[PDB]
Amino acid sequence: MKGDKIVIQHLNKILGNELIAINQYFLHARMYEDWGLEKLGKHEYHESIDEMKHADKLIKRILFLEGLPNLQELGKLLIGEHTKEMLECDLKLEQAGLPDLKAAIAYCESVGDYASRELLEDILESEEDHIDWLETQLDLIDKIGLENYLQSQMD
Amino acid sequence: MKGDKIVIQHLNKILGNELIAINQYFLHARMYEDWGLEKLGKHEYHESIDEMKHADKLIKRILFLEGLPNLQELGKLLIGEHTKEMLECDLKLEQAGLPDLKAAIAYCESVGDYASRELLEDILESEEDHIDWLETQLDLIDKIGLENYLQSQMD
Amino acid sequence: MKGDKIVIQHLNKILGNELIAINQYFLHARMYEDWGLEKLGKHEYHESIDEMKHADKLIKRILFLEGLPNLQELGKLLIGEHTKEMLECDLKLEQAGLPDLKAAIAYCESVGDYASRELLEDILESEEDHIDWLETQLDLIDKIGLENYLQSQMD
Amino acid sequence: MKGDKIVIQHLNKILGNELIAINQYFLHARMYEDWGLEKLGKHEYHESIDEMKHADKLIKRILFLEGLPNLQELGKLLIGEHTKEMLECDLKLEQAGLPDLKAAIAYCESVGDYASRELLEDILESEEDHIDWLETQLDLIDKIGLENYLQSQMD
Amino acid sequence: MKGDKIVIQHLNKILGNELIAINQYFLHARMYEDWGLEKLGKHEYHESIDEMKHADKLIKRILFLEGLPNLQELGKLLIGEHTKEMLECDLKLEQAGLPDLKAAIAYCESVGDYASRELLEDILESEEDHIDWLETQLDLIDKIGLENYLQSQMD
Amino acid sequence: MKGDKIVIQHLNKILGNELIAINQYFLHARMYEDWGLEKLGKHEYHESIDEMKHADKLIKRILFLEGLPNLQELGKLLIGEHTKEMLECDLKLEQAGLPDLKAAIAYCESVGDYASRELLEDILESEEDHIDWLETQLDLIDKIGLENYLQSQMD
Amino acid sequence: MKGDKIVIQHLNKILGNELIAINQYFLHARMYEDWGLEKLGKHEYHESIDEMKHADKLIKRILFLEGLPNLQELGKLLIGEHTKEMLECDLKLEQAGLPDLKAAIAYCESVGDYASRELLEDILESEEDHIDWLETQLDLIDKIGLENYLQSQMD
Numbered sequence A, B, C, D, E, F, G: 001m002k003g004d005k006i007v008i009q010h011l012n013k014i015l016g017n018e019l020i021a022i023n024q025y026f027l028h029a030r031m032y033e034d035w036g037l038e039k040l041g042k043h044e045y046h047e048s049i050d051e052m053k054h055a056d057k058l059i060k061r062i063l064f065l066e067g068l069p070n071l072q073e074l075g076k077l078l079i080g081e082h083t084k085e086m087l088e089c090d091l092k093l094e095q096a097g098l099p100d101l102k103a104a105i106a107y108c109e110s111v112g113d114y115a116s117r118e119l120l121e122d123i124l125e126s127e128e129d130h131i132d133w134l135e136t137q138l139d140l141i142d143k144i145g146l147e148n149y150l151q152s153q154m155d
């Protein structure tokens, strides 16, 4: 079904952000795992798989609207070197993506592409959950201390 | 069956206390939950459903005694900002209420409303348990330390 | 994540509404239960837990948006003395509440707080169903008569 | 297998009636359920489904006989405003059809379409059961009074 | 609950379209099955049912909104003579109604009937799925040839 | 019980028809089976066991009516050499028999042998089904092509 | 454990190749599925999930050898517009990656990094299966024909 050209661009924009979140979280995930931070690793891993599913939904939607998904452009990944940093990189990421999503949702409303809007709304709801977990981890670190926090993430 | 007017005034009195407890603990529960303090949040949550059961019992008792339950008044809520403060507020709350319960059990005895006395006695035994747990946490905080005590409340 | 101050203000207001419903429906529930009107008390009981869930969702959303939930203020409960009056009071409360829900959804739209909009929409759809049942009963009372209606509610 | 032009003409006619029954009963079913008359609702709902299986039987027989089903035209639709009237309108229709079926069975006999006859015969027996139930409901209203009948159709 | 006259007017309009879908899909389904194309028949049969659930949702909304469902008027019916055309007539219908759903959701939003909106919203997502399947069948006919496509729809 | 002499002559008549069908379909079945046309062979096989059941019914009916079943005469067998021919032969066979069945049902009616009429009516309804399937295959052959139609009959 | 700088450069290179395939196979996969070619889509999907696992194995190896996995560089994706081209694009990828794996294995052998060589041999064996499958589908297309091949890929 022929979709809106500008709507397809927003979708590709959102898709671009997702592909980045995918590699960054996967790498981070395997890093925690490599440090012996199993709990932290398993959670970062799922965050990765979620982003993969977001990418999947977007791709399918774009194909349905008769557009061309763009998996060719990979933006700058924000890799960290230590836990507190990695958390803050994922946070910067998730945040930087909110303006694009709300701008995409707002555009779909304006052109009557309500299904795409519901799609982006779901993903959005999911992005706010990640942002929440992340903030919580950072607060937890300041509350119980890096040593205790990292001990809690082993196994 | 028409009950003693003063006994019902007492019941409504204690009822207002519980209603406060309900709100205070539910907010504290969602706050812990929100800070990622799983354990604390779960306990405070139950303490809350507990107070609801207490309120429920009094309501029924009042209704039976042919009085009018007062779910209209809600006293000051002692909301803490950080864990130790929140625990102290709940303890202070559970203690300011005991005198009233005892003054009520004492009264039922004086006018022979033995059944209402058994109701309060039960609510009472629970209250000394809510207080027991609370006092325990406060002492743990001083024995293992806040950071350690918080850490252990995470999962 | 810091949310819109006006959105949180809206949310907090709706929270007060729910808290009112909880108490009103709970009293009505125990009253029906107290008159031997099992069916009615059972339903009213559920309508009450429903409102408790609503309140819980708003609280959590408010906390996430980093605001202070208000379990403190409690509005005027509309208590009835007889079945028909009790149904009216509840319908009245559920209706004098919609304008606020809609004014809030509309607001979230204006500031792009789409996730809060979804929260409100859900409880909104639930509210129209509470209103449906209520109206359904009121009309029923006039179709089969009060005596028959009450009889039906006993068992 | 080419069948008699006139036999198919009857089949087509019978079919229009079913399509009418379908919509009419479907509307009464939702109306009943909208008023809170579960018992009446479910029955009208199933009767609606019954009429759907009837139409389905005809469409197939017609297609097989190499004719063109006319799902296009829909005749008058006796919609009622109250139970009593809705029950009567459903009985008028359920009767205004009998002749057609009876008339169609006689026709099939005269031209040797025995298979079409037995098929109609079946819808015919079923229709006499839609009528028995309807006439019974109306009589019941007399024997126990409207408000009583309704009270029975609630749950 | 009294709803907006214009919103109920849209709902009523949307409802007519579904009733058409129901009949057109049901006829095609029997035709397919009559020719021996089981797969095609089974799918049209399901799409026929889907449309019935759509119409049922509207009817309830309309009744709840205190309007009068119009099961009476039935729009024209795009009947096809062969698969290729039958598939096209069904795609046209699904597209000649998509705008209405879009036009209705926009209306509900402008007058605050958020509940009706989410209801149309769903039928809408579903209809984009009916359309995706139809477009796919047509494209498949191209890529593999009518004879192969039909051969694959047999068993 | 002594039956009508003409009714029995009819029964024996139709009986001879079935016996032919039995042989024709069994040979056609083993021929398909032999050509590796699994599906066709299986269907033709059942159509054959069917005709056996028909013959069985008539035999019993004749025996009851106190007549002598004639399994002695066997008419011309229409054996095809290739698929389409075989289908046409079976169709031609199933059609030359219908007039006789109808002429027999008609006769039973005239002499009041209603039970024998029900027997024929059933055999009749099956016959229009054997014809339905056969006509379907012939049309499929012309829609997807012989090679394609044969291919699909292999497994 | 510190690994050989060049072994790591090789590992990073293979990783880059895997990362390309992931996206190419995932886009091709959703494309087949968007066209209704379920068989093909499901296969490409799995081959894509395979590359993901491959990349995962390398990421881990690299982290263990204390190097920095590079998920930032993304080579040129070869995306086709129709099945045959898409199959040829993936085959080209696999082939263009074979030299690099063999080069890497050979280097690990020259510096005593046997565990890294073992890992690579495994991925190598997996890559020859993808190739065998791709070459086979292309041959299958020549033996039976695009129309038939595509039909076979439908379900």
Ligand code: HEM
Residues within 6 Å of the ligand: B019, B022, B023, B026, B027, B049, B052, B053, B055, B056, B071, C019, C022, C023, C026, C049, C052, C053, C055, C056, C071
């Ligand atoms: C007049 C005050 C209230 C009364 C009498 C009341 C009573 C109850 C009762 C008896 C239950 C059943 C619990 C069980 O035994 O499993 C319940 C459940 C619950 N209450 Fe309350 N409640 C009150 C206020 C509140 C408030 C203000 C909140 C939130 C701030 C709340 C939130 C809940 C929740 C979430 C549940 C669990 C519901 C579920 O089972 O899914 N309640 N309440």
Ligand code: HEM
Residues within 6 Å of the ligand: D019, D022, D023, D026, D049, D052, D053, D055, D056, D071, E019, E022, E023, E026, E027, E049, E052, E053, E055, E056
């Ligand atoms: C236009 C108004 C119609 C409405 C509102 C309606 C509604 C429904 C609903 C809600 C169901 C049950 C769906 C499920 O749970 O699976 C149903 C089933 C069905 N409908 Fe309709 N329908 C309509 C018209 C028709 C017509 C005109 C036909 C035939 C031409 C038809 C034939 C059927 C059949 C065969 C079933 C399945 C029955 C069974 O499984 O026992 N419907 N319909």
Ligand code: HEM
Residues within 6 Å of the ligand: A019, A022, A023, A026, A049, A052, A053, A055, A056, A071, G019, G022, G023, G026, G049, G052, G053, G055, G056, G059
């Ligand atoms: C174009 C980007 C990618 C897309 C669209 C994608 C999509 C997916 C999807 C749909 C799944 C299934 C999710 C589930 O049901 O659990 C999956 C699984 C997985 N992905 Fe990705 N993925 C991508 C990139 C990656 C990358 C870059 C890696 C690793 C560096 C990766 C590693 C994995 C793993 C390990 C699994 C699960 C494997 C298993 O099933 O055992 N993915 N991916």
Ligand SMILES: [Fe+2]
Residues within 6 Å of the ligand: A018, A021, A050, A051, A054, A123, A127
């Ligand atoms: Fe995401």
Ligand SMILES: [Fe+2]
Residues within 6 Å of the ligand: A021, A051, A094, A126, A127, A130
């Ligand atoms: Fe995210």
Ligand SMILES: [Fe+2]
Residues within 6 Å of the ligand: A148, A151, B148, B151
């Ligand atoms: Fe510790």
Ligand SMILES: [Fe+2]
Residues within 6 Å of the ligand: B018, B021, B050, B051, B054, B123, B127
């Ligand atoms: Fe208590």
Ligand SMILES: [Fe+2]
Residues within 6 Å of the ligand: B021, B051, B094, B126, B127, B130
């Ligand atoms: Fe307590």
Ligand SMILES: [Fe+2]
Residues within 6 Å of the ligand: C018, C021, C050, C051, C054, C123, C127
């Ligand atoms: Fe509510």
Ligand SMILES: [Fe+2]
Residues within 6 Å of the ligand: C021, C051, C094, C126, C127, C130
């Ligand atoms: Fe409510």
Ligand SMILES: [Fe+2]
Residues within 6 Å of the ligand: D018, D021, D050, D051, D054, D123, D127
């Ligand atoms: Fe009927």
Ligand SMILES: [Fe+2]
Residues within 6 Å of the ligand: D021, D051, D094, D126, D127, D130
């Ligand atoms: Fe009927």
Ligand SMILES: [Fe+2]
Residues within 6 Å of the ligand: E018, E021, E050, E051, E054, E123, E127
């Ligand atoms: Fe629809």
Ligand SMILES: [Fe+2]
Residues within 6 Å of the ligand: E021, E051, E094, E126, E127, E130
């Ligand atoms: Fe549709």
Ligand SMILES: [Fe+2]
Residues within 6 Å of the ligand: F018, F021, F050, F051, F054, F123, F127
């Ligand atoms: Fe036979």
Ligand SMILES: [Fe+2]
Residues within 6 Å of the ligand: F021, F051, F094, F126, F127, F130
């Ligand atoms: Fe036969």
